[PDB]
């Protein structure tokens, strides 16, 4: 057998003979491959391999690339582990005016190297263990081993030796300003403050020289917030508690909308009586939302400066964050003051649209487009057109979700394949290194889930597990599996601690991992919420709610900097386009103009997009900066996306710009995205802007006791929107005291 049946569909278990469709282009052909054969992991790491992580380069490269376990940067090498900290003098903000790009970055330097007394010629560094956000890297050379435990949000690096002892090697002799024998407080020549800890009685030697040595088979390194002896004493308390387990456990309180996440470590004692706990370094998206019960654990003056702003210290076994899920919708309802016949015209115009490629991404954009059009067609009373759209979605999905052709043999394209080596579903044709690097599975498969959710909204039978739902559930498991999934690692895309998704499967860059389109991540989470609600899968829905809500908190900090605290004052733009572990760029992965470096973090527009309007002052600030740089409202590309975004705070302005230019060009044209972005339509644009004009501003201050809703506020007048996926009527309670009844399979208002 070369395929596994899942309901009416199947996935391939053997790499297919790819149908290249006569395309000779080497770039295209190279995309139709598999992720690396070699995984640098020990035999202690078994089953589906974790990917899309901040630490991924350890698994892919023989050693590693540069990594960002904030507050540190580290890299594995034959000689040992290089440790670095970007001080203010290491940080730069550069603009390339001609490219239209900006870059906030540090250096790839070495403050010191953690070394093993027995060898400076390790053969490889492997993943020996990992948990929700820490990794254990193992440098190996026969009997000589050095195990390094580190993580994002850990001011400790824990070092365990086999057949040797500790060495810290420096290019310029450090200033050892506190010598407690087994504990040392030290500074680099350029005044970066660190500490090293060994068991009592194991004293440091070589003070005043370039090489600090210790006979111990265990040391910890800490980054100190300050050259402060009291802080050193505090770090000493947790320096011998090596993190083994780390979990981010969450709950969703449906009644209140509260997503509660508890981050909990389990440590192993390296000396008698070492506490079960650590010192955490919290990111802004965490500490801005710290639970009251965690406040007492904060170490107030323990601050670290990093790319993502200020980290703060917190001591103990666990801490808790509290966030608010704002709801999502399957679409905007029919509440706009549009010319209905004009909208009908645009809906029929959209039948000329076609996918601009055969790969999962371009096909994804097309099916997202059709899924967006179908509820608008329904609302306008174009019921057969809506059915045509959903029929076309059915045809496409029923093709892609089957791995075998009529003869029973594997297809050459439009299929999914399970790579057993890593443990991931890959789609062919592939693009953006979705197969070769395990990239972007949330971005691509999110569109497939969108299509499935729209089908399920009208046809529950299709969506059943024994029919086509099984295969959709498989795609979702690939990118956001629960724990103990036999086929996939836990929550592939998501970093529970950094608070965001990472797009690159391999992370083999010296800036760590990256994410560009945070909105396509949010699109994926939205669609899983919708799909799971439609198919009555509460556990899956809640997981997607947790992801949507957490990612939102990271987006507002690191992509948007809504609070105006993170980006350097000298940084011109009002958005970071690509977030990396170690840097921030106003730039795109492809060659683009001015609009795209903003709008790649807005697209696509859908019923889960309302998170983009929670901060009206930000929306204004970002729009005004883009307008300033353009010099007018003559957008270089994707005009409709700018209008839709503008409509969050000024729909009159959005409407005026739309009226002037929407009809500039006629039917679908792949070569011309000046007015209409290729994943968008005139129909969507017109429907969105007019809806916003009537509804007013997004109102995030009101929650509901059901998950599929939105609240708008126009000069004090609230509009409450709920979609009911149930066969039964429901009552929804809003947090401001308002209450509504909703009929089965309908909006409460604006069904059309
Ligand atoms: O249905 C399917 C459909 O599919 C189609 O198939 C397609 C197919 O067409 C295509 O074919 C290819 C052709 O398209 C191609 O034609 C090109 C054309 O693309 C190009 O366009 C130019 C634009 O690309 C360009 O855009 C700019 C962006 O590129 C730029 O992106 C930047 C990133 O670069 C940057 O990345 C950095 C990263 O580099 C860095 O990496 C580190 C390494 O450098 C380092 O190396 C070390 C070294 O440092 C040391 O000194 O030495 C050692 C030596 O051993 C070395 O190892 O290693 C470290 C790790 O240790 C690395 O880290 O890492 C950092 C992070 O750490 C990373 O940042 O990242 C930034 C973001 O941060 C990103 O912005 O960005 C700018 C700004 O936005 C952008 O402008 O722009 C110019 C114009 O200005 C364009 O010209 O043009 C050329 C020339 O005209 C064309 O040739 O040709 C190739 C063949 O060569 C084809 O493959 O292929 C795709 C798949 O790829 C396929 O899907 C079919 O066609 C279709 O029919 C079908 O229907
Ligand atoms: O307008 C023609 C122009 O379009 C370009 O397509 C871009 C995509 O390259 C871009 O890909 C994004 C990725 O960089 C990453 O964020 O992940 C997903 C894909 O996995 C995408 O968000 O997406 C935008 C928006 O859909 C597209 O406009 C072509 O690359 C370029 O060659 C072409 O000239
Ligand atoms: O890293 C995730 C992103 O990767 C992008 O592709 C990269 C190529 O453009 C570049 O030439 O090479 C690197 C590997 O060295 C690729 O990762 C994708 O286009 C993005 O969609 C993706 O998010």
Query: How many whole angstroms from 30 Cα to the centroid of ligand 1?
Result: 14
501: DSSP letter: B
Query: How many whole angstroms from 119 Cα to the centroid of ligand 2?
Result: 46
The CB density around residue 461, as the number of other CB atoms within 10 Å, is 11
Query: How many whole angstroms from 361 Cα to the centroid of ligand 2?
Result: 9
Query: How many whole angstroms from 434 Cα to the centroid of ligand 3?
Result: 9
Domain ranges of the chain: 57-244, 340-698, 699-752
| Burial of residue 727, with CB atoms counted within 10 A of its CB: 0-12 exposed, 13-18 middle, 19 or more buried | exposed
Residue 310: partners with Cβ closer than 8 Å, 6 or more residues away: 284, 303, 304, 565
Residue 619: partners with Cβ closer than 8 Å, 6 or more residues away: 612, 613, 645, 648, 649
Ligand 1 pocket, residue 710 CB under 6 Å: no
Ligand 1 pocket, residue 435 CB under 6 Å: no
Helix (H) or strand (E) holding 544: helix 538-554
Q: Whose alpha carbon is nearest atom 4 of ligand 1? A: 28
Ligand 1 pocket, residue 217 CB under 6 Å: no
Distance between CA atoms of residues 427 and 24, nearest Å: 20
Ligand 3 pocket, residue 503 CB under 6 Å: yes
| Helix, strand, coil percentages in the chain from 3-state DSSP, rounded to 5 | 30, 25, 45
Ligand 1 pocket, residue 101 CB under 6 Å: yes
Q: What is the 3-state secondary structure (H, E, C) of 702-727?
A: CCECCCCEEEEEECCEEEEEEEECCC
Ligand 3 pocket, residue 514 CB under 6 Å: yes
Q: Ligand 3, closest atom to CA 361?
A: 21
Ligand 3 pocket, residue 504 CB under 6 Å: yes
User: Which tokens belong to 505?
Assistant: 């499967």
User: Which tokens belong to 433?
Assistant: 């290194």
Which of 40, 37, 242 has its CA nearest to residue 127?
A: 40
Q: What is the 3-state secondary structure (H, E, C) of 503-535?
A: CCCCCCCCCCCEECCHHHHHHHHHHHHHHHHHC
516 annotated binding-site participant: yes
Residue 10 Ramachandran class (φ > 0 left, ψ -120 to 50 alpha, else beta): beta
749: DSSP letter: S
Spell out the alpha helix ranges (H) of 165-300.
Answer: 229-238, 284-287
Query: How many whole angstroms from 442 Cα to the centroid of ligand 2?
Result: 15
The angle subtended at Cα 140 by Cα 139 and Cα 141, nearest 5°, is: 135
Ligand 3 pocket, residue 437 CB under 6 Å: yes
Residue 54: partners with Cβ closer than 8 Å, 6 or more residues away: 67, 68, 69, 133, 152, 495, 498, 502, 507, 512, 513, 581
Taking the CA of residue 514 as centre, how many other CA atoms within 13 Å lie in the half-sphere pointing to its CB? 19
365 annotated binding-site participant: yes
Q: To test ligand 3's pocket by mutation, which of 427, 437, 479, 585 has the most ligand atoms within 8 angstroms of CB?
A: 437
Distance between CA atoms of residues 358 and 399, nearest Å: 13
Residue 380: partners with Cβ closer than 8 Å, 6 or more residues away: 334, 340, 343, 344, 347, 752
Q: Whose alpha carbon is nearest atom 22 of ligand 1? A: 591
Query: How many whole angstroms from 492 Cα to the centroid of ligand 2?
Result: 22
678 annotated binding-site participant: yes
178: DSSP letter: E
Give the end-to-end CA distance of the chain in Å, rounded to a whole number: 49
Q: Which CATH number describes the domain made up of 57-244?
A: 2.70.98.30
Distance between CA atoms of residues 396 and 398, nearest Å: 6
Q: Ligand 1, closest atom to CA 587?
A: 79
Active-site amino acid positions: 440, 516, 520
Instruction: Give whole-number Cα distances, 33 to 29, 327, 421, 475, 684, in Å.
Output: 8, 39, 13, 19, 36
745 annotated binding-site participant: no
Q: Whose alpha carbon is nearest atom 9 of ligand 2? A: 590
Which of 331, 325, 252, 721 has its CA nearest to residue 534?
A: 331
440 annotated binding-site participant: yes
Query: How many whole angstroms from 433 Cα to the centroid of ligand 3?
Result: 7
Give the domain 340-698 fold.
Answer: Glycosyltransferase (1.50.10)
Query: How many whole angstroms from 590 Cα to the centroid of ligand 2?
Result: 7
734: DSSP letter: B
Distance between CA atoms of residues 343 and 334, nearest Å: 11
3-state secondary structure of 545: helix
Distance between CA atoms of residues 752 and 750, nearest Å: 5
Q: Give helix 383-400 / helix 441-458 axis angle, nearest 10°.
A: 130
Q: Whose alpha carbon is nearest atom 31 of ligand 2? A: 590
Query: How many whole angstroms from 708 Cα to the centroid of ligand 3?
Result: 34
Nearest ligand, measured from the Cα of 66: 1
Distance between CA atoms of residues 507 and 60, nearest Å: 8
Distance between CA atoms of residues 347 and 385, nearest Å: 8
398 annotated binding-site participant: no
Pocket of ligand 2 (CB under 6 A): 361, 365, 432, 440, 443-444, 516-517, 520, 589-590, 603, 673, 679
Ligand 1 pocket, residue 585 CB under 6 Å: yes
Q: Whose alpha carbon is nearest atom 26 of ligand 1? A: 591
Q: To test ligand 2's pocket by mutation, which of 432, 514, 679 has the most ligand atoms within 8 angstroms of CB?
A: 432
Nearest ligand, measured from the Cα of 582: 1
| Burial of residue 506, with CB atoms counted within 10 A of its CB: 0-12 exposed, 13-18 middle, 19 or more buried | buried
Distance between CA atoms of residues 107 and 86, nearest Å: 7
User: Which tokens belong to 692?
Assistant: 């916003």
Q: Whose alpha carbon is nearest atom 98 of ligand 1? A: 27
Identify the experimental approach: X-ray
Q: Whose alpha carbon is nearest atom 104 of ligand 1? A: 28
Q: What is the 3-state secondary structure (H, E, C) of 313-326?
A: EEEECEEEEEEECC
Q: Is the CB of residue 185 less than 8 Å from the CB of residue 229?
A: yes
Ligand 3 pocket, residue 359 CB under 6 Å: no
Q: Whose alpha carbon is nearest atom 43 of ligand 1? A: 509
């Amino acid at each position: 057998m070369h395929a596994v049946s899942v309901g009416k569909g199947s996935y391939a278990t053997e790499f297919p003979e790819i149908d290249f469709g006569g395309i000779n282009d080497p770039g295209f052909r190279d995309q139709q491959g598999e992720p690396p054969a070699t995984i640098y992991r020990s035999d202690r790491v078994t089953g589906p391999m974790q990917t899309n992580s901040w630490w991924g380069s350890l698994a892919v490269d023989r050693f590693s690339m540069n990594q960002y376990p904030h507050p540190f940067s580290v890299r594995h090498r034959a000689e040992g582990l290089h440790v670095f900290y970007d001080a203010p003098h290491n940080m730069v903000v550069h603009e390339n005016r001609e490219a239209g790009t900006w870059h906030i970055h540090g250096a790839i330097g070495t403050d010191f190297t953690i070394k093993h007394s027995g060898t400076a010629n390790f053969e490889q560094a492997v993943v020996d263990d990992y948990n929700d956000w820490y990794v254990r890297g193992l440098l190996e050379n026969g009997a000589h081993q050095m195990a390094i435990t580190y993580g994002v949000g850990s001011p400790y690096i824990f070092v365990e030796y086999e057949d040797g002892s500790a060495v810290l090697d420096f290019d310029i002799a450090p200033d050892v300003w506190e010598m407690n024998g087994h504990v040392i407080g030290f500074s680099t020549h350029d005044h970066k403050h660190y500490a090293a800890f060994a068991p009592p009685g194991q004293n440091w030697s070589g003070i005043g020289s370039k090489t600090l040595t210790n006979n111990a088979d265990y040391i910890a390194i800490a980054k100190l917030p300050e050259k402060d002896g009291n802080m050193l004493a505090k770090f000493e308390q947790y320096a011998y508690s090596v993190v083994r387990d780390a979990v981010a456990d969450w709950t969703y309180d449906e009644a209140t909308g509260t997503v509660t996440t508890t981050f909990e470590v389990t440590t192993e004692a390296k000396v008698q009586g070492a506490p079960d706990g650590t010192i955490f370094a919290l990111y802004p998206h965490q500490y801005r939302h710290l639970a009251s019960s965690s406040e007492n654990q904060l170490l107030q003056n323990y601050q670290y400066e990093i790319i993502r702003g200020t980290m703060i210290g917190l001591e103990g076994k666990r801490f808790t964050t509290e966030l608010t899920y704002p709801g999502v919708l399957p679409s905007l309802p029919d509440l706009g003051d549009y010319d209905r016949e004009r909208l009908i015209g645009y809906l029929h115009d959209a039948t000329s649209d076609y996918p601009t490629g055969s790969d999962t991404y371009e096909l994804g954009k097309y099916i997202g487009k059709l899924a967006t059009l179908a509820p608008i067609a329904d609302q306008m009373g174009e019921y057969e057109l809506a059915e045509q759209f959903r029929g076309e979605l059915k045809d496409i999905l029923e093709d892609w979700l089957q791995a075998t052709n009529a003869s029973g043999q594997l297809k050459g394209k439009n299929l999914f394949y399970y790579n057993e080596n890593w443990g991931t579903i890959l789609g062919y044709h592939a693009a953006h290194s979705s197969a070769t690097r395990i990239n972007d599975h949330h971005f691509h498969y999110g569109y497939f889930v969108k299509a499935a959710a729209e089908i399920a909204r009208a046809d529950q039978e299709w969506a059943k597990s024994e029919n086509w739902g099984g295969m959709i559930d498989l795609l979702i498991r690939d990118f956001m599996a629960d724990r103990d999934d036999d086929l996939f690692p836990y929550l592939r895309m998501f970093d529970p601690y950094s608070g965001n998704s990472w797009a690159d499967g391999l992370a083999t860059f010296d800036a760590g991992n990256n994410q560009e389109s945070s909105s396509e991540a949010m699109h994926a989470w939205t669609n899983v919420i919708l799909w799971a609600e439609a198919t009555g899968n509460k556990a899956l829905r809640d997981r997607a709610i947790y992801l949507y809500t957490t990612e939102m908190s990271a987006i507002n900090e690191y992509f948007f900097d809504v609070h105006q605290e993170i980006f350097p004052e000298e940084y011109g733009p009002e958005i970071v386009t690509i977030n990396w572990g170690g840097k921030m760029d106003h730039a795109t992965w492809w060659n683009s103009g001015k609009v795209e470096k903003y709008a790649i973090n807005w697209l696509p527009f859908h019923g889960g997009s309302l998170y983009l309007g929670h901060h009206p002052d930000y929306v204004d600030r970002a729009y005004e900066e883009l307008r300033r740089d353009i010099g007018s409202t003559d957008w270089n590309l994707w005009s409709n996306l700018v209008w839709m975004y503008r409509a969050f705070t000024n729909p009159d302005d959005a409407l005026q710009q739309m009226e002037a230019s929407i009809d500039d060009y006629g039917l679908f044209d792949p070569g011309n995205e000046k007015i209409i972005e290729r994943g968008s339509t005139k129909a969507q644009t017109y429907h969105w802007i007019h809806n916003l004009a009537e509804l007013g501003r997004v109102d995030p201050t009101v929650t509901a006791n059901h998950p599929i809703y939105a609240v708008f506020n126009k000069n004090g007048n609230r509009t409450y929107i709920v979609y009911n996926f149930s066969d039964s009527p429901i009552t929804v309670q809003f947090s401001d005291g308002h209450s509504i009844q909703v009929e089965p399979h309908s909006f409460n208002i604006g069904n059309g």
